[PDB]
Write a protein that binds this ligand. Structure first.
Ligand SMILES: CCCCCCCCCCCCCCCCCC(=O)OC[C@H](COP(=O)([O-])OCC(O)COP(=O)([O-])OC[C@@H](COC(=O)CCCCCCCCCCCCCCCCC)OC(=O)CCCCCCCCCCCCCCCCC)OC(=O)CCCCCCCCCCCCCCCCC
Ligand SMILES: CCCCCCCCCCCCCCCCCC(=O)OC[C@H](COP(=O)(O)OCCN)OC(=O)CCCCCCCCCCCCCCCCC
Ligand SMILES: CCCCCCCCCCCCCCCCCC(=O)OC[C@H](COP(=O)(O)OCCN)OC(=O)CCCCCCCCCCCCCCCCC
Ligand SMILES: CCCCCCCCCCCCCCCCCC(=O)OC[C@H](COP(=O)(O)OCCN)OC(=O)CCCCCCCCCCCCCCCCC
Ligand code: HEC
Ligand code: HEM
Ligand code: HEM
Ligand code: HEM
Ligand code: HEM
Lengths: 101, 68, 72, 49, 60, 240, 52, 380, 108, 54
């Protein structure tokens, strides 16, 4: 329902990576699949992600967060890494199921 | 005798407060209950500990001022 | 090792000399609200387990003391 | 544009004797270096003791 | 007038060898001053209790 | 019984953070130990040379050790002999071995009071409460002969007779010899006897506290001065 | 999370490596009973039963 | 002309590890504890070196040698209480080090984490035999209790415990070999810490965000050098105030009595940094189960990298697992308190509950919470 | 792929003992250097087993050494190999320094 | 000596020093080998053995 959407955006506010200007896909741990999906990114998305990570590192160095009018919000959190990551796990699963037999 | 221990004076000053006198009242109820001689092996160390704890807290507040 | 860690483009950084700036610039006036904000963000995750085990410690001590007492 | 960039305001951070933009430096640089190196020398004296 | 930190930088803190000499001489004078002051604080807080306060009745 | 009496916290003159020991009380407590407690207890880690600069002068402590009569040898003829004591002589044991100590003192072994304030919970509050707490047993409990009711001893049945009372020794400084005064003096002396560094320890703690209160904000200022390049750093992002 | 090795090829590898791993386990057991001088097995063997 | 910092070989090694090491710019005060552990290890080496110059490992002359150190050697009380309270400060630094590793996902540096687990085992063993060394009542009786507890493993327990003792009880052979082992073991700890630093400098360091910190990295000098100096001087403040003002609050008073094999103390408890594990070995009324539960508590601390099911590294953005982590921390606190308590009502049930909650949180609840958080972030 | 060249701990052992280039014509004298290291380990190991029974006190040091020889199982063996291993250590050390002097190895 | 002549303090501190010095010796041997391996071993002829190494 819409209760689940409101509860997810409350959890989005409570987790706290929105306060550093980060996206959800920036917070993914850099495994091999994630690193390959970073390598398959276009250059503008790469530069945006690296600047967001560097700015979050600077803000956490100063133990500070952003002013509220440049926080990330639940609606405009675009999921840029999802199709690249989905294709990477589909290709790796295909290679694994080939090598199983 | 002719030279008096100040600890006894601070003690008898500290057995007249409320907590210490009610611990003492429970102590003589324990004493005459056991000394009623029902032939059962209970003793009176707990209310003695209560009375001694209150009295020694009181005298530990005000003992060392009289000692050189 | 420096020089081959990452690919960074279109980022400019500005700094100052440590002799050109204050050591403690607006220390209390910007430090008390920021410490209060971090406290507001973290007490509801940190404190209540410690409050619960404080009550467990006090209850256990008083239950041990009551089990010391002779039951009439 | 490389001419479109400029250093942002550091007036929240810089010292009082270097706050005035229309007064040249090399008049108070010795005092600032002396104060910072005096802090360094005094904590070196304490550590040596 | 030139300030006291300005003269300290121009006369002592500029070179490194004069910096180290200032640190050494300040360490000498500072251990003398600090030891005397901290000791004096110690007998001012504990008067009549240390042995030095009571080695007059029995020293003769 | 299984019940435990917890002695209170008396306001000792060395209870403070920088508070020293009253050395006249240590001298008086040594007099108490020499007159009373040394008939049954030993001091197997304290020598007579530890009393100089603390309670007595060197001639006074040398005269105190001269009245001691110490086993030594063997001589040229090949046997034990007896000498007056020196400053480097430790405090004399009343018994040659713990079995004779158990035999003389009605079974129970009188322990070595060299760490007895550091080997009991409560410290010298326990010693003061034990020496001044000798009372009659309550109703019902049977006290065996050779045992005395002290509620501060665990088990409440100690093998120690009450060793102090009013005017048990005559002090050399015109002090009233009440039982509480004697107990407080011997408790202060026993506190000294397990930590003779105590005054020196608190003097070093005072110097350390003053030095560290000087050193914390200056090395904090060094850290903050060096990190002020990064803390005032501002970033920018201009894609083309 | 060990579901990557559920196939006929890894079963084939397993039945290839049964005898070598079993022989290495036999080597380990014989070396352990040899070094420890264990009395359970060394009493079951003819020639080594000379010191008992 | 060359640069002697980058061409001379040992200068090249120290330049790689300490001067021009690319460190994250945003690591907090929790990252100072590795250097604190190193400098406290060095303090332990130096103070124990000066302690062993007068100690004599012999049951007739060990307690008396300790008193001779305290009362006759100049500042021997200072070095001795520096050694004991430095062991306590060392275990404080270890606990905060492992807590930093658990919270911020640093266990994914797997070989570094396992070398650390080996370091922790070696340090706990070293401090145990060091506490045996002064030959007090508590030293002898704690050694006796720990080794009779070790004697419960089947068919080799009695042989191993009589081989460790050098006899049929704890006696002078045990004291001499315990002095030898206590002297040698911190050098193996130092070598394993060198291997720890080797693996960490190959794999890089971790930030509190858990992100890739290579976009913003700063040299180690002068930033983390001055931060480490500040942390070291703060640790010296805490250690020296606990030596000079409260020298006998983290130990027990009846270690100031000589060892008596006849008399036994009523409260036989180890040092405080063992007490939580002590509660676990009393959480089961079976000796083999208690020994196994202790060693697999430290082994599930070793097994922690395999239980990571979330797609985020650090707990900065994961509040449910944060709540579970602080429940685990408070559970460790009451495990310490229960281990410091006698076996009486109501401490058996509280200790059993604390043990089962600790193992349930480490094993079960944290990966399920990671799955829940990934579902709640629309990952899966 | 291989652990000999990529694993950070086995890389050191490979660089120092496995794929290390050494001259093809060095005589037996060079073996003395490795022998010195072996003697060091031997001394350390035997020294540890002397330390499990040695009592550093002037009353009970000679007596403790006699107890090592006469009552400890194979303790005479460990004590005498510690002594003669110190002697063999110095023999190998002297020949190591003589190799350094003769073949011009002091230019390092 | 730790005193007027050789006594128990000298014996105990000599025991501590004798135990701890082989570990500085082992670390110095590690540094010895490290300083060797930058240039390689010498050969009995004294010549450049880089033409023939195994
Ligand atoms: C009211 C409370 C104080 C509020 C206040 O003014 O806070 C200022 C300020 C608030 O932070 P901020 O102004 O937002 O910016 C500071 C940075 O975020 C962070 O920068 P920083 O200055 O906090 O430095 C990082 C951290 C680095 O921490 C360390 O170096 C310590 C490492 C841990 C040592 C552990 C030893 C063992 C502990 C066992 C338990 O520094 C400290 O922890 C400060 C140590 C101060 C020592 C005494 C100085 C006098 O807090 C501090 O400076 C902390 C100390 C406050 C006193
Ligand atoms: C300790 C008291 C609480 C300290 C505190 O402030 O905790 C909150 C803090 C939050 O930090 P974080 O969420 O990373 O940052 C948000 C933005 N800075 O959280 C942290 O700093 C988390 C890291 C804490 C690490 C130390 C606490 C645990 C210590 C004991 C661990 C024992 C582990 C097991 C050992 C035996 C096996
Ligand atoms: C319901 C809403 C959340 C709670 C009320 C707060 C509402 C605030 C609304 C306004 C917003 C203010 C700013 C918010 C800042 C960030 C969000 C925050 O602080 O949330 C509350 C926090 C975390 O909440 P969250 O993790 O989202 O809840 C779990 C969901 N499944 O923390 C909590 O939720 C509190 C967690 C308490 C846990 C208590 C545990 C008790 C038991 C501990 C036992 C330990 C010992 C065990 C011993 C065993 C053996 C005896
Ligand atoms: C005795 C053995 C003498 C011996 O064998 O000498 C021959 C050999 C020199 O032979 P070389 O010139 O290398 O030619 C190879 C084919 N003959 O000689 C050698 O190889 C000897 C090289 C030196 C090794 C021996 C060192 C002896 C001890 C030296 C102690 C002094 C060192 C400094 C002390 C301070
Ligand atoms: C011979 C009559 C003694 C005199 C004189 C003193 N003490 Fe004693 N003490 C004596 C015995 C036989 C015992 C053993 C008691 C037992 O139950 O085993 C003791 C014990 C103590 C203790 C130890 C108490 C404890 O909890 O361990 C203390 C602290 C003590 N005694 C103090 C003490 C002092 C201060 C004395 C001088 C005034 C003194 N005792 C004299 C026998 C005798
Ligand atoms: C013997 C005591 C120990 C010493 C001397 C020691 C030393 C160090 C040092 C110097 C560092 C680098 C600085 C730092 O990150 O704090 C470090 C990091 C680390 N240690 Fe240890 N350590 C010890 C115990 C442990 C233990 C017991 C563990 C395992 C639980 C461990 C795991 C780690 C990890 C994972 C890191 C990296 C954390 C990060 O990069 O953020 N260490 N250690
Ligand atoms: C190689 C270096 C070390 C040496 C030479 C050494 C030596 C000694 C000696 C001689 C003692 C007996 C002195 C005494 O107990 O009063 C001792 C005690 C002790 N040591 Fe160490 N030690 C070393 C390292 C460590 C380390 C790394 C720890 C753990 C942090 C440690 C923990 C202890 C403890 C807990 C005691 C008991 C203190 C007491 O109860 O008095 N030691 N050590
Ligand atoms: C503590 C005892 C010593 C140990 C453990 C030791 C160890 C070693 C080792 C392992 C090597 C490499 C193997 C070899 O080439 O022989 C070596 C070589 C060498 N050592 Fe030592 N060494 C010791 C004493 C010395 C001394 C006292 C000197 C100086 C006189 C010295 C100078 C050299 C030199 C010059 C080489 C190079 C060999 C060459 O290329 O000709 N060593 N040492
Ligand atoms: C850390 C390692 C070492 C330890 C713990 C150690 C310990 C001991 C001990 C306890 C003794 C006295 C026992 C006895 O005399 O039989 C001793 C004797 C001796 N050690 Fe060591 N040692 C070590 C390494 C070395 C090394 C490397 C050398 C050679 C330089 C050495 C040379 C000797 C010699 C010559 C004696 C006298 C043997 C004799 O009684 O005649 N030790 N060592």
């Amino acid at each position: 329902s819409k209760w689940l959407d409101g509860f997810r955006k409350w959890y989005y506010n409570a987790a706290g990576f929105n306060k550093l200007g980060l996206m959800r896909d920036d917070t993914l741990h850099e495994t091999e699949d994630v690193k390959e999906a970073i390598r398959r990114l276009p250059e503008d998305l790469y530069n945006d992600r690296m600047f967001r990570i560097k700015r979050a590192l600077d803000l956490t160095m100063r133990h500070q967060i952003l002013p509220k009018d440049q926080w990330t919000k639940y609606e405009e959190d675009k999921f840029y890494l999802e199709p690249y990551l989905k294709e990477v796990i589909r290709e790796r699963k295909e290679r694994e199921e080939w090598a199983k037999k | 005798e002719e030279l008096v221990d100040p600890l006894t004076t601070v003690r008898e000053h500290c057995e007249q407060l409320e907590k210490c006198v009610k611990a003492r009242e429970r102590l003589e109820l324990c004493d005459n209950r056991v000394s009623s001689r029902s032939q059962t092996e209970e003793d009176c160390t707990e209310e003695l500990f209560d009375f001694l704890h209150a009295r020694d807290h009181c005298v530990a507040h005000k003992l060392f001022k009289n000692l050189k | 090792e420096f020089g081959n860690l990452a690919r960074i483009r279109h980022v400019i950084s500005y700094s100052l000399s440590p002799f050109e700036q204050r050591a403690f610039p607006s220390y209390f006036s910007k430090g008390i609200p920021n410490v209060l904000r971090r406290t507001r963000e973290r007490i509801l995750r940190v404190a209540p387990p410690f409050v619960v085990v404080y009550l467990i410690y006090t209850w256990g001590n008083q239950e041990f003391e009551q089990s010391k007492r002779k039951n009439p | 544009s490389h001419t479109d960039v400029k250093v942002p305001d550091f007036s929240d951070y810089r010292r009082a004797e270097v706050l005035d933009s229309t007064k040249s430096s090399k008049e108070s640089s010795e005092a600032r270096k002396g104060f910072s190196y005096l802090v360094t020398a005094t904590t070196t004296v304490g550590v040596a003791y | 007038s030139p300030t006291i930190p300005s003269r300290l930088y121009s006369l002592l803190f500029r070179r490194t060898s004069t910096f180290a000499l200032t640190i050494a001489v300040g360490a000498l004078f500072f251990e003398r001053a600090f030891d005397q002051g901290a000791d004096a604080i110690y007998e001012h807080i504990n008067e009549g209790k240390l042995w030095k306060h009571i080695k007059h009745k029995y020293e003769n | 019984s299984d019940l435990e009496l917890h002695p209170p916290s008396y306001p000792w003159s060395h209870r403070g953070l920088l508070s020293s020991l009253d050395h006249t009380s240590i001298r008086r407590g040594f007099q108490v130990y020499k007159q009373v407690c040394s008939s049954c207890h030993s001091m197997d880690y304290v020598a007579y040379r530890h009393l100089v600069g603390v309670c007595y002068t060197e001639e006074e402590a040398k005269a105190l050790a001269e009245e001691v009569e110490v086993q030594d040898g063997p001589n040229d003829d090949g046997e034990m002999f007896m000498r007056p004591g020196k400053l480097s002589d430790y405090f004399p044991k009343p018994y040659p071995n713990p079995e004779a100590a158990r035999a003389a003192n009605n079974g129970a072994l009188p322990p070595d009071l060299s760490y007895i304030v550091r080997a009991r919970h409560g410290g010298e509050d326990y010693v003061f409460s034990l020496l001044t707490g000798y009372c009659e047993p309550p109703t019902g409990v049977s006290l065996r002969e050779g045992l005395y009711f002290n509620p501060y001893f665990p088990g409440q049945a100690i093998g120690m007779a009450p060793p102090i009372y009013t005017e048990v020794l005559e002090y050399d400084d015109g002090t009233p010899a009440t039982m509480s005064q004697v107990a407080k003096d011997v408790a202060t002396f026993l506190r000294w006897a397990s930590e003779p560094e105590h005054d020196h320890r608190k003097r070093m703690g005072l110097k350390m506290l003053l030095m560290m209160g000087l050193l914390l904000p200056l090395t904090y200022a060094m850290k903050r001065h060096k990190w002020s390049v990064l803390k005032s750093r501002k970033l920018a992002y201009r894609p083309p | 999370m060990l579901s990557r090795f559920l196939g006929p090829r890894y079963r084939e590898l397993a039945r290839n490596w049964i005898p070598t791993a079993g022989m290495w386990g036999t080597v380990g057991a014989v070396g352990l009973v040899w070094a420890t001088d264990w009395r359970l097995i060394l009493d079951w063997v003819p020639y080594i039963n000379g010191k008992f | 002309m060359t640069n002697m910092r980058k061409t001379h070989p040992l200068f090249k090694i120290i330049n790689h590890s300490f001067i021009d090491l690319p460190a994250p710019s945003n690591i907090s005060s929790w990252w100072n504890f590795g250097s604190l552990l190193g400098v406290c290890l060095m303090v332990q080496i130096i103070t124990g070196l000066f302690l062993a110059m007068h100690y004599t490992s012999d049951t007739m002359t060990a307690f008396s040698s300790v008193t001779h150190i305290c009362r006759d050697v100049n500042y021997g009380w200072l070095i001795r209480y520096m050694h004991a309270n430095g062991a306590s400060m060392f275990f404080i630094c270890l606990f905060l080090h492992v807590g930093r590793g658990l919270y911020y996902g640093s266990y994914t540096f797997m070989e570094t984490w396992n070398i650390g687990v080996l370091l922790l085992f070696a340090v706990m063993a070293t401090a145990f035999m060091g506490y045996v060394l002064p030959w007090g009542q508590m030293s002898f009786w704690g050694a006796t209790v720990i080794t009779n507890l070790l004697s419960a493993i089947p068919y080799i327990g009695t042989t191993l415990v009589e081989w460790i003792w050098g006899g049929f009880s704890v006696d002078k052979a045990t004291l001499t070999r315990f002095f030898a082992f206590h002297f040698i073991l911190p050098f193996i700890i130092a070598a394993l810490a060198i291997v720890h630093l080797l693996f960490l400098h190959e794999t890089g360091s971790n930030n509190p965000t858990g992100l890739n910190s290579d976009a913003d990295k700063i040299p180690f000098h002068p930033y983390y050098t001055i931060k480490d100096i500040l942390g070291i001087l703060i640790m010296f403040l805490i250690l020296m105030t606990l030596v000079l003002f409260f020298p006998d609050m983290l130990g027990d008073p009846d270690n100031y009595m000589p060892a008596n094999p006849l008399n036994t103390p009523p409260h036989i408890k180890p040092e405080w940094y063992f007490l939580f594990a002590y509660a676990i070995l009393r959480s089961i009324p079976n000796k083999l189960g208690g020994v196994l539960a202790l060693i697999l508590s430290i082994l599930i601390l070793a097994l922690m990298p395999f239980l990571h099911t979330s797609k985020q590294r650090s707990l900065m953005f994961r509040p449910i697992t944060q709540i579970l982590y602080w429940i685990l921390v408070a559970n460790l606190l009451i495990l310490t308190w229960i281990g410091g308590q006698p076996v009486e009502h109501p401490f058996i049930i509280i200790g059993q509950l604390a043990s089962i909650s600790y193992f349930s949180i480490i094993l079960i609840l944290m990966p399920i919470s990671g799955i829940i958080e990934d579902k709640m972030l629309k990952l899966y």
